[PDB]
Design a binder for this molecule. Structure first.
Ligand SMILES: Cc1cc(OCc2nnc(SC3CCCC3)n2-c2cccnc2)ccc1-c1ccc(S(C)(=O)=O)cc1
Ligand SMILES: Cc1cc(OCc2nnc(SC3CCCC3)n2-c2cccnc2)ccc1-c1ccc(S(C)(=O)=O)cc1
Ligand SMILES: Cc1cc(OCc2nnc(SC3CCCC3)n2-c2cccnc2)ccc1-c1ccc(S(C)(=O)=O)cc1
Ligand SMILES: Nc1ncnc2c1ncn2[C@@H]1O[C@H](COP(=O)(O)OP(=O)(O)O)[C@@H](O)[C@H]1O
Ligand SMILES: Nc1ncnc2c1ncn2[C@@H]1O[C@H](COP(=O)(O)OP(=O)(O)O)[C@@H](O)[C@H]1O
Lengths: 96, 576, 576
């Protein structure tokens, strides 16, 4: 994103930091314990080399929370705060 | 001797040092029966000439501790191999007179090594000093206070636990402290009645305690040169009565201020702004929202804790130029009585051009030290404008300085006191990451001042100037349909300029008239224009102009409605 | 011995030093009965050969203080471990003869460490010198004056409070001071009647006092070589009468000036401009506005203070090239009798290309020291032109040099004396931040000279040249419908060139005529063309040209009306 995304730089998707991350991952796996998890809101602009085998190949899509998921999120956010039982949370989650 | 009265500036770190050192020194026997570790070392740092040595001496005198002064270059000037003996003997002597205070003035000379550490003998001196400082067996009550211009100048191992574990930034004295410093430095010269030391104190921005003393001495010397020299009656000792007959006049102080050259004007200022809500005539919704976001967490922290809500620590002001965003930030800081730090756009542009973003880390650390503080990033969109705005660079909105600011903010919130306020006249080009939660998410729009707001702005601008009651201000404010605060200030300044020019020209002519035609009886009619009149304001308004066009206000209205709260929930009702 | 008469240049810092040192030295007993701290150290800095040591010696002689000279390399050339003894003994001896003045010539050798601080023994010397300098127990009246090429060359701890707390920049002598230096250096050579030392002084720009002495000595040696050598009558001691018979002629001085090579031509000049309002024929509205903005705050500061108005400290001249903006700035500086500093475009471009904007800080500090001063940034739009102007760089108008200038201006205004004047031929491309309040907000438009203005410009250009009364100047000025000041200067220069060529060719032929046909009686008819005639001016005007097209004047008119005072308030009346 910093380099662009629609036009960007004249060069390709490769950058210094991602290249170093790829080198470390390629030199990784020896440890058998470190597990790399990557989160990105712009999958289109992510470097394709990141998704090659031996890298973050398992792509997982996180969709918008469902009604039940929304209810759980509201409960988690409001667990600490004193919430009156009168306010129905399922209705609010479904409304959103 | 020297005491708290001598220590001027009222900068409120002397109180912190007192709270630090009384019990270790004022009640030394108490720590013998209680298991607690007192402050083994205190690092006083700040601009030179701020009285750090004076503060240490005053604390030693007021607490009765045996004060020992280890001058930096005094030991450094000694021969290698025997300076170490001097340092060791100094600590032993201070140990003997328990409780004792060992003051190391100019600590950045004994242990200047910042891991560069040039030379050989200086490494020995730093290591031996480290051994001594860490060698305090917690017996007796020797407290080692050191002076340094900046915390990072001394060796980092000196900054570690047990050597110097707590630091106080004395900093430049403020207007209130500058006035108190002037009072302390002007107490035996028999100051004149006309001179008040208040106007000089306000005009004395940028001076330090040493600078204030030098200015006072220069004014005294000007007074001595102006008078008592013409008579030329001098002896071995000037007569006390003859010297007392002179009074330091305001003119002498003014000349001295003109000949001051303060020794660190550039140094950043951490000061409680004097601006008040009165200066801004309105923004009641904005005023209440700012009061909420800033004041409520501190005035009523318990109620924030009860609901388990963490108050936002970032607010971004957006609006047309000249509407009072900087003034609003100063007013909000003043209401909470918290220190205000302002980072204008030139500083950010300098950090960006120089590729030196580590200054952001230093700025945030300074804001953290001066808590409670309101860290204001004025005109934060400057870097985006510098890179473009319509097309800009090929890359995105991310830049080095904003990225460092985001990193510091993400690593912030720990302090619980620093509050970040951002002002930007181009919200469209501001980096979106700035507005994410945990950052300056609370966007506040500052609109053009209303008629009542315009009246208040005119009154604030014209409070100092003599304005005739004939000139109606409400009519002028209402007449200005869309003038910004800057436009109103320009109108007032132009009216004052017209009045000043007319007064100067008139009294100049009137003086010709006496020179050309010497009148037999001298009878001055006073000033031909003693206050600003209706005609001056009419001529000034003739040149009134609207700096802010309606198209840029339209863009701001677009962004405001670009933060639109949806269009389907306005009638949300729970099922009952 | 040496005194104020020997000290030449009339540079007006000797007066400041006198005011500094009389009472501490001229009236030492006075400070015994009065509690005041005198100047413990004074740092005289400037280009080498400016007489700093001479000034110190003259002050010591004229005040009776025992002068002690501690040569930099004299102590530095001594063996390590015993040079410290030399410095300590020098201070003790100066202490014994109280009051005494200790002069440290070439201070940048004893303590050159700028925090780089190479070596080991030199660190000892700097630290011990620091201990001695700070070790002055305020007893006796020893004043330590030091000489250094630049303030930043010496160790910063030497610049701190109590070591060297006040600095004086002797600087290069000016035309008036160059003339006085020539007079002092030409007093025993029996200067000839034809030589006046005024033309040489004007042509002597760039020399220092040492340079002036060297030029005078070279002229004397040329005189000795030209005569008294042909006779070759020499003995053990040349006869006084024989040597007195020679007179240094203007030709010898001219040759010496040709063989001068001044030792610091590049050094920036801080000089009161000799230009006067007479050189500019008009701009009465502009002249009055400039008089207001600059002169009024100082001539009548009380009236500015009465109305609570702070006068603007920045003015931006915009107009077509060659209309006299630089001359106008020089004239305004001359009227206020304030030092003038000019920063031309090449300097800004050099700072921009070299990525060295810290020079702006140095320039502003120099302007601050030479107060009252008019800091003029000539052709400030050069960087914008260098980056483009129609398309330019991808980024905005912000650049490193302008950003540094803005930072210095924002940090300025404290001095109350420096006044920033900006000239730009391309107002459209100038950065808008330059025009914000607190910056060069007062925009002044310099239009093409009028008919009367053109007449005045022609008279000023032709004042030195011999112009025949036959050639009517008003007709020529009126004839030039839109010629700029540069165009008129070019026309005058071309006319002078034509006259010079005609005179040279004619006298050359006339000399052939006397070589080809030796006349029996020599009777020179004088010069065939003694002054500039109508035909020369007609031929020159034949090549007259309008450098400034009407389209660029149209763009300037657009910008001028782009600062339009609205169109609805012209009839503003208060309700009555
Ligand atoms: C047996 C095996 C274990 C392994 O590692 C297991 C492991 N332990 N800790 C961790 S990490 C920790 C767990 C939670 C956070 C991270 N892991 C691990 C490994 C991979 C992915 N996630 C975790 C690798 C590779 C192998 C094998 C597979 C086939 C053959 S053959 C010649 O074809 O017959 C030989 C060897
Ligand atoms: C109680 C609390 C106070 C706080 O800080 C208050 C504070 N003091 N000085 C300042 S600063 C100064 C004031 C004027 C200028 C700046 N602040 C402050 C904090 C935030 C925003 N503005 C000011 C933070 C967070 C909490 C909490 C909230 C919920 C829970 S739980 C587990 O859900 O039950 C636990 C802890
Ligand atoms: C009285 C005053 C003088 C001043 O400075 C005057 C000055 N002297 N040398 C110079 S410089 C030199 C002159 C020729 C070349 C340059 N100046 C000067 C100042 C501004 C612009 N040009 C010159 C500033 C500001 C003030 C004041 C105005 C209002 C108030 S209140 C609280 O509202 O009642 C308090 C203080
Ligand atoms: N607030 C103050 N009250 C009285 N004197 C002050 C004050 N601030 C600075 N000074 C002056 O500063 C002089 C030297 O400064 P100092 O106390 O040594 O600080 P530093 O070591 O940082 O330079 C002192 O002699 C004192 O007169
Ligand atoms: N204004 C002056 N009047 C008389 N002599 C001068 C003057 N300026 C420079 N000189 C000459 O400069 C010579 C040496 O320069 P000096 O005084 O030592 O200055 P610096 O130490 O900076 O080089 C002196 O011998 C003196 O003759």
């Amino acid at each position: 994103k910093a380099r662009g995304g629609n036009i960007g730089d004249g060069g390709g998707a490769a950058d210094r930091v991602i290249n170093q991350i790829l080198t470390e991952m390629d030199g990784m796996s020896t440890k058998k314990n470190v597990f790399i998890i990557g989160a990105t809101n712009r999958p289109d602009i992510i470097d394709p080399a990141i998704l090659r085998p031996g890298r973050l190949d398992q792509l997982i899509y996180i969709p918008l929370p469902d009604e039940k998921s929304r209810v759980a999120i509201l409960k988690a956010n409001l667990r600490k705060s004193p919430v009156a039982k009168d306010v129905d949370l399922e209705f609010l989650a479904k409304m959103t | 001797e020297v005491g708290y009265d001598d220590i001027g500036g009222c900068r409120k770190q002397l109180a912190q040092i007192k709270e630090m050192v009384e019990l270790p020194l004022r009640h030394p026997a108490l720590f013998k029966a209680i298991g607690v570790k007192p402050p083994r070392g205190i690092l006083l740092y700040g601009p030179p000439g701020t009285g750090k040595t004076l503060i240490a001496r005053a604390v030693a005198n007021e607490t009765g501790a045996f004060f020992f002064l280890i001058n930096g270059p005094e030991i450094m000037s000694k021969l290698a191999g025997e300076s170490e003996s001097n340092l060791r003997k100094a600590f032993e002597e201070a140990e003997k007179n328990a409780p004792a205070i060992i003051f190391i003035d100019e600590l950045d000379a004994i242990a200047p090594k910042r891991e560069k550490t040039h030379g050989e003998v200086e490494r020995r001196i730093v290591s031996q000093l480290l051994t001594l400082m860490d060698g305090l067996k917690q017996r007796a009550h020797v407290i080692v206070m050191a002076a340094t211009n900046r915390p990072n100048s001394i060796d980092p191992a000196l900054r570690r636990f047990g050597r110097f574990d707590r630091e106080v930034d004395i900093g430049i004295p403020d207007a209130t402290g500058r006035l108190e410093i002037l009072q302390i430095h002007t107490k035996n010269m028999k100051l004149a009645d006309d001179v008040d030391l208040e106007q000089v104190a306000n005009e004395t921005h940028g001076h330090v305690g040493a600078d204030l003393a030098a200015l006072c001495s220069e004014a005294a010397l000007q007074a001595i040169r102006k008078k008592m020299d013409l008579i030329d009656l001098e002896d071995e000792t000037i007569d006390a009565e003859v010297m007392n007959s002179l009074a330091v006049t305001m003119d002498d102080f003014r000349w001295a201020l003109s000949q001051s050259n303060p020794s660190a004007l550039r140094e950043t200022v951490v000061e409680v702004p004097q601006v008040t809500w009165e200066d801004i005539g309105g923004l009641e919704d904005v005023k209440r929202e700012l009061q909420e976001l800033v004041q409520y967490p501190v005035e009523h922290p318990d109620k924030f804790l009860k609901f388990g809500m963490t108050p936002s620590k970032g607010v971004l002001f957006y609006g047309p130029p000249g509407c009072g965003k900087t003034l609003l930030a100063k007013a909000i800081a003043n209401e909470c009585q918290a220190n205000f730090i302002s980072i204008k756009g030139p500083e950010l542009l300098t950090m960006w051009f120089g590729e030196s973003e580590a200054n952001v880390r230093e700025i945030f650390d300074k804001a953290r030290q001066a808590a409670p503080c309101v860290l204001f990033f004025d005109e934060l969109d400057s870097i985006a404008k510098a890179r473009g705005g319509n097309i800009g660079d090929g890359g995105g909105a991310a830049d080095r300085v904003i990225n460092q600011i985001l990193t510091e903010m993400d690593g912030m919130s720990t302090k619980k006191n620093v509050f970040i306020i951002g002002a930007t006249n181009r919200p469209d080009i501001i980096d979106p990451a700035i507005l994410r939660p945990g950052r300056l998410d609370q966007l506040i729009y500052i609109p053009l001042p209303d008629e009542k707001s315009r009246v208040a702005i005119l009154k604030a601008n014209l409070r100092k100037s003599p304005v005739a009651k004939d000139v109606d201000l409400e009519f002028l404010a209402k007449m200005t349909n869309g003038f910004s605060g800057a436009d109103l200030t320009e109108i007032c300044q132009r009216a004052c300029k017209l009045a000043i020019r007319e007064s100067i020209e008139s009294e100049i002519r009137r003086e010709r008239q006496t020179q050309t035609n010497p009148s037999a009886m001298e009878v001055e009619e006073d000033d031909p224009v003693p206050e600003i009149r209706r005609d001056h304001f009419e001529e000034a308004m003739r040149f009134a102009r609207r700096s802010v066009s309606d198209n840029d206000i339209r863009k701001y209205e677009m962004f405001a409605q670009t933060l639109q709260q949806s269009r389907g929930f306005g009638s949300f009702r729970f099922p009952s």
